[PDB]
Amino acid sequence: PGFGSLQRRLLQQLYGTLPTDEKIIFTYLQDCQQEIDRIIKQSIIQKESHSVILVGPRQSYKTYLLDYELSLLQQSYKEQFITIRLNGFIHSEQTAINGIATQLEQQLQKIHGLTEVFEKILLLLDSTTITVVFIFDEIDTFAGPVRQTLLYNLFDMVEHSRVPVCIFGCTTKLNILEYLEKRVKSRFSQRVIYMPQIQNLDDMVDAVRNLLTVRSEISPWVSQWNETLEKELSDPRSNLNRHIRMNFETFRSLPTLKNSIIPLVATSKNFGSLCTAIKSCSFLDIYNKNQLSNNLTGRLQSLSDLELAILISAARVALRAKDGSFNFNLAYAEYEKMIKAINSRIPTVAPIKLWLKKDVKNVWENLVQLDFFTEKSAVGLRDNATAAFYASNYQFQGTMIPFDLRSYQMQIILQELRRIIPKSNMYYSWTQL
Amino acid sequence: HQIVETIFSKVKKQPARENEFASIYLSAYSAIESDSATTIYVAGTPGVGKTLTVREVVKELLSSSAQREIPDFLYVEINGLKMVKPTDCYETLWNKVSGERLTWAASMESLEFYFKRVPKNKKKTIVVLLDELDAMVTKSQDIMYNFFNWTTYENAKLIVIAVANTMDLPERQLGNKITSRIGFTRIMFTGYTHEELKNIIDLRLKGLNDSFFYVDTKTGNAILIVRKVRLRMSADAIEIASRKVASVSGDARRALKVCKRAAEIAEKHYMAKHGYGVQTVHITHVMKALNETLNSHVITFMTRLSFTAKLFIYALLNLMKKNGSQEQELGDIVDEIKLLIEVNGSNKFVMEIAKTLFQQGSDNISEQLRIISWDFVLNQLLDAGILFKQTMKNDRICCVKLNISVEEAKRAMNED
Amino acid sequence: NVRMMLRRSMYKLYSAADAEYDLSLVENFKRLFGKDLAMVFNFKDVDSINFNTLDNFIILLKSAFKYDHVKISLIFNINTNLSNIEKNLRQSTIRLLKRNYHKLDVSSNKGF
Amino acid sequence: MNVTTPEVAFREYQTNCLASYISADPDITPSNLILQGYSGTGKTYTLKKYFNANPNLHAVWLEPVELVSWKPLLQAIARTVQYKLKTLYPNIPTTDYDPLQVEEPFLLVKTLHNIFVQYESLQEKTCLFLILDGFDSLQDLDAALFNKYIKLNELLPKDSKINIKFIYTMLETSFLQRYSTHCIPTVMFPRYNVDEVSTILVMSRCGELMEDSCLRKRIIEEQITDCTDDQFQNVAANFIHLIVQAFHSYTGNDIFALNDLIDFKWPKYVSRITKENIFEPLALYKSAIKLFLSTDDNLSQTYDLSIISKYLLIASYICSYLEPRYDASIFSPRYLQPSLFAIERLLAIFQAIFPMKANIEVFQNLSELHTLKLIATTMNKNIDYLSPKVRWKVNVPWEIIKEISESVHFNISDYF
C-alpha cells in the first residue's frame, strides 16, 4: 500500500513539475543557468533592459530554465514582473498582436483584482505603476523572409522604453544572426547563449543521479532507492549503465532517455518488482523493439506469401530498369514467368497457382498502402497549408491513368530483401537476379 | 529592496554628424522659408545615425519656429516597419493632419484633395518623416509614388522626408515617373571610423573616466563624487573595440554595446572577488566581447555531437570525395555507412559497434535497414540548420546536402 | 474533391429541409426537424467522375451509419459495361457496394 | 491515481503503456501522447476499450475522418469540451461561448482559457483527455499542422484547475519520423499475425453470423433435431478458418476484407447445408468448393459496340502503341502506358483498315467513344476537342482489343 507513495514521487520528479524548493538543476547546465538568471534578476529586480536568444536543439531543456527562474522570482517579486508568451507555431504574424493584447489584460486583471499600440501599452503601464517580460519560441519562424516587424519593434523598445523591458527568444537554428535582418540584427543586444550539450558520460551519469534520487523521506524505501540507484550508476557492468552508455553514444538528448525510463517506473507494482526490473533492465529492450516494430523490417515480416512474391517480382523489374520504374503489367508478367519457372523445375508426371490478374489487384492495393511502393514523383505530405491548397487544386496524372499502368518506384531494394527474407522461404532463391 | 548600483553602473548607463546635420538643415530651411514643397531622401546602413540626425534637424527647425525665424509647421513621424498594414499610412497621415477617422480610400483621396486643391494661405506647413520607406513597398508602389507626388504640388506646402536602405533605389526598383520627382535631393550617411567611435564613447563617458566614487563596502552601492574608490577604462581597450567594430560595421550601437558588455564583464569581476583602489576596465574585458562576436559555436557544437551524427557527416564527406558531388541520396549514405563499418570489420569491437548500430545491443531485435536513431540524427542536423534535405516521400532517393562549409566540417572530424 | 462534395450535399439537404454544412447536420437532423432522413445520392455520370474522390467520399459517407435515424441509397449511371468501374475503384469500396446492390438495364435496344 | 487495465488480447504491451501516461493527476501525465499503427491494427478499438473501464477519466472523442479540414477540428474541440464540462459539473454558473467563433488556434486557446477560468472555483486540479482519432487521416493536411497541437497547452495558464492532455492516433510511419526529435511518448501498433487475425475474427464475428435469419430458415428446413449451441458455434467457426486459409494470400492480414468475404459467401455456404452436411464439415467444403476457388469480390460480349466503333478502337490502339516511324511502311511497348497521337493518324489508319470516307457517323462514333471514355484526352475541365492542343490516347487494355479484332475478323496480332 505504501509503495504507491514512492512510486508516484519518482514519477512526479521525473515529469519535472516539482516545487521550486524541490526542483533540480543539472550540473552541466548551471553556467548558462546563472548567465540567464543574472540577466533576469537585472531586468526584474534592478530594472534593466535586455534581449537574449537561447540556442540548442529541441528537447534541450531550453525553456525549463526560464520556467524555473520565473517560478523562483514569483516568490519574492510577485508584483513586479509581467510575462508575455508567444509561440511561433501557433501564433502567426497577425495573431501575435492579439495574443499580447489579451495576455497583458489578463495579467493586469489579477495584478489589480503598431505605431501607437506599443506606446499606449507603455503609457498604460506608466499610469498603472512592474517589468515586462517577453518570451519567444521558434524565433526563426518570426525571423523568416516575412517582414519581421514584431521583433523589430521589440528589440527597438529595449533602449527606448520608459518601463523596463526584457525579451527572451528560443530556437534551434545556429544561423540565427543571419536569420535576423540587418535592421533587426543591429537592434538586438546579441548576447547569444548556446545551451551546454552533454559532452561526457560523467555528465549523463550525474544527470541521472540528480533526476532519480529522492532528497526527502517521503517513503521509508527512499534510502533503499537512492542507494540502489547509486549502486547501479556505479558498477560499469550494470545493465542500466550499459543502456545509459548506449544512449550517450547514439543520441545526446537526455529527455529521450527520460521518456524511455518513464514506463519502467510507471509499470512497477511493488518495491521488489521495481528492484528486479531496474537490475535486469530488460524492459527497455522491449520498449526499443516496439519503437522499431513499424519500421521497414517490421512491416516486411508481416506480409503474406503472394504479397512477398509480388514484392520480389516488382523489385526485380525495378533493378533491371534504368530508372528503377515499374508498373503492374511488368510485375504480373514477372510473377507469371517465375511461377512458370518454378513449375518447370518440378518434373512432369507421366499419366503452383498463377493467381488471376484480377485477384492480384488486392495484393497491389495492400502493398501500395504499406509504403513498400511509391508513385514515381510522389511528394507525399506537403510542408505547409498553402502547398496543400495548390496540391489539392491540381489533378495529378498518376491518379487518372489506369490501375495497371501507374508508375511506381521501390523503397526496399532487392539487396535489402535478401538480407531480411529468411532463406527458408520458397521464393528466397529469386532474391538474386 | 533598494536598486543597488555598483561603480560600473554609470558606464553601462551612458556630435559626429554635424556636416550631415548642416546639409539637411540648409535644404530644409530653404524650402520651408520659401513656403515651397519638396521631397527629401535619406539613405544609409543601420546604426550610422540617420534617424537621430533627422530628429535633431526637426527639433532645431521647431526651435527656429519658436524663435519665429520660420513660420509654424506640423511634424508627422511614420515608420514603415511599425504599420500593421500598408493601407494604414493614408489613415494615419490624414488623422494627424485633420483629426478625422475616415477609411484609407477616403483618407488617400482627402490627402490628394487637400494638398492639390486647398489654397496655400488656408494651411499649416506639414513635415512628414517616412522611416523605413523601402519597407512600405507594395505591389503597385503607390506609397512610394503618392507621398512624393504630392510634394510636386505648389499648393501643398508639404515637406516629406524618407529613410531608405540605398541611395539609388528609385533607379534600381522604382519607375522613371517616381525617380524624376525625387531627383537630385538625396543624402547618404557613411559608417563611422574607429577614432569617431572612440570619440563618441569618450563623449558619452566624459564625466565618468578617472572619476572617484563612494562605494558601500557592505552592498557595493556606489555614489558619484563607505570608502573612496576610483574607476577607469583603458584607452587601448577602447581603441581595440573601436578598430574591431569599425572593421565589421558602421553601426554605432555595436560600439556602445561592446562597452556595456565590457563594463558588465568588469562588474562580474568586481562582484566575484568581493562576494556580495582604481577599477580599470581592462583590454581583456573588451577582447572577451570581441571574441564572442567573432567566434562561431558551429565547430564546437559539431565536436560535441553524438557518435552517430559524426559518423553520418563522415560518411557524407566520404561520398563527396568518392563522387565529387555536393549532395548524396540516402540510398548512397545508408549503405556507405555499412561499407565503412565493414571495411574495418576485421576488428573485434567492430562486432560490438555493429550490434549497437543495427540491433541496439539486443538479441530480440533483428537486422535493421537503418542505424539506430537514423531518423533522430537526420532530423537533428536539419533542426540545427547543419543539414539540408529535399521533400520526397521515398526514403532512398531523397537527397541530403550539407549547409555548413566543408572545411569546418573537416576540422570538426579531425578533432574527434 | 470531398470537401466540395460534402458541402454541396449538406447544402441541398438543408435547402430541401427548409423547403419542407457538414455531417453534424445529418447528426442533428432529427433534433431539428423531428423526422427521419432518407438520402438518395444520384450519381448522374460515373464514367466522368474522378474515381479517387468518389472512392474517398463513399468512405466518408460510411461513417454516417452510426446514426439510427439515417438511411442512404446510391444510384449509379453507367454508359459502358459494369466492369469498367471495377478497374478504377479500390477493392475496399467494391466490397462496401457489393453487400446490397441491384443491377438494371435501361437501354432502348432491349431485345428489339 | 491507480487505473485498472482491460485485458485486450494481442495489445497487452500497449494497454500497459496506456496505463502509463494516463492518470487522474495532471502532474503525472504528459502534454502530448501518440499511438501509431496502420489501418486494421486495433488502435481505435483499444483506446475506447481502455477508456470504457475507467469512467472517471474525462475523455472527449473527435474524428478528423468526419472533420474534413482543420477549422471543423478546432471548432469541435471547443464545442465538445464545453458540452462535456457542462455534463460533468453542471452546478457552476457559466456563460456560453459560440464554438463557431473559433477561427484560429489562438482563439481556441483563448476560449479554453476563458472556460477554465469559469471553472476556476473547482477544488482539485483535473485532467481533460482530448482524443483525436487518425490525425494523419485528415484530408486537408500539411506537415506544419501537428506542431500547433504539440506545443499548445504551455500557452495555457498552469494555475488552471482543468488541464488538457492530448492523445493522438496515427497511421503512417513517414508522419512520425518528422517529429522524432520532440521525444513525444509513442506507443506502437504492429500488424497482426495470421494466427492473431484468425482468432480475432473467431472471437468477434461468430455469434453475429451464428443466429442470422438465413440459418433460421435452414435449420427448420433441414429439420435438425439434436442441434445445440455448441454445434452452431463450431460450424460457424469452421467457416472463418476455411476462408482465412483460402484467401490469406489474397487479402493479406486485413480484418475488413476477410469480414466482407465472409459476409458475401456466408449465405451461399449456408445454402449448401443439408442434413448430412453438418457434423462433417469436410463434406461442406467438398460441396461448396467453387466458393473457395474464386474471390467473388467482383461486382458482377462484355462490350457491345457498333462495327464502326470497333474498327475505330482498333485503329486507335494501333496509333497508341505503334511507333510513328512505321506508318509509311507497314500500311502502304505493351507494358508501358500508351503514347499520345493525333486524329489525323487515327482517321488515316481507320480508312486503311476498315473492310468509309468522312460521313458524320464516324465522328459521332468517335465522340461516343470519348463519352464512353474508351479513348482519353489530355485535359480534365472545359473540354475543347476542336482546339489543336488536345491529344488522344487509348484507355482500353489489350485483352479487349483482341476480342474486338476477333469479332470483326481483324489481325492486329500480325502487326506487332
Ligand SMILES: Nc1ncnc2c1ncn2[C@@H]1O[C@H](COP(=O)(O)OP(=O)(O)OP(=O)(O)O)[C@@H](O)[C@H]1O
Ligand atoms: N514546466 C515544466 N515542468 C517540467 N519539465 C518541463 C517543463 N517545461 C519543460 N520541461 C522539460 O523540458 C524538456 C524539453 O525541453 P524544453 O521543454 O525546455 O524545450 P523547448 O522549449 O520545447 O525547446 P525548443 O524551443 O528549442 O524546441 C522535457 O524533458 C520536459 O520535461
Ligand SMILES: Nc1ncnc2c1ncn2[C@@H]1O[C@H](COP(=O)(O)OP(=O)(O)OP(=O)(O)O)[C@@H](O)[C@H]1O
Ligand atoms: N553621433 C552620435 N552620437 C551619439 N549617439 C549616436 C550618434 N549616432 C548614432 N547614435 C546612437 O545611435 C542610435 C540609433 O541612431 P538612429 O536612430 O539615427 O539610427 P540609424 O542610423 O537611422 O539606423 P537604424 O536604421 O538601425 O535605425 C541613437 O539612439 C543614438 O543613441
Ligand SMILES: Nc1ncnc2c1ncn2[C@@H]1O[C@H](COP(=O)(O)OP(=O)(O)OP(=O)(O)O)[C@@H](O)[C@H]1O
Ligand atoms: N484485440 C482485438 N480483439 C478483437 N477485435 C479486435 C482487436 N483489435 C482490433 N479488433 C477489431 O478491429 C476492427 C477494426 O477497428 P480498429 O480499431 O482496428 O481500426 P483502426 O485501425 O483504428 O482504423 P482506421 O485507421 O480506419 O480508423 C474492430 O471492429 C475490432 O473488432
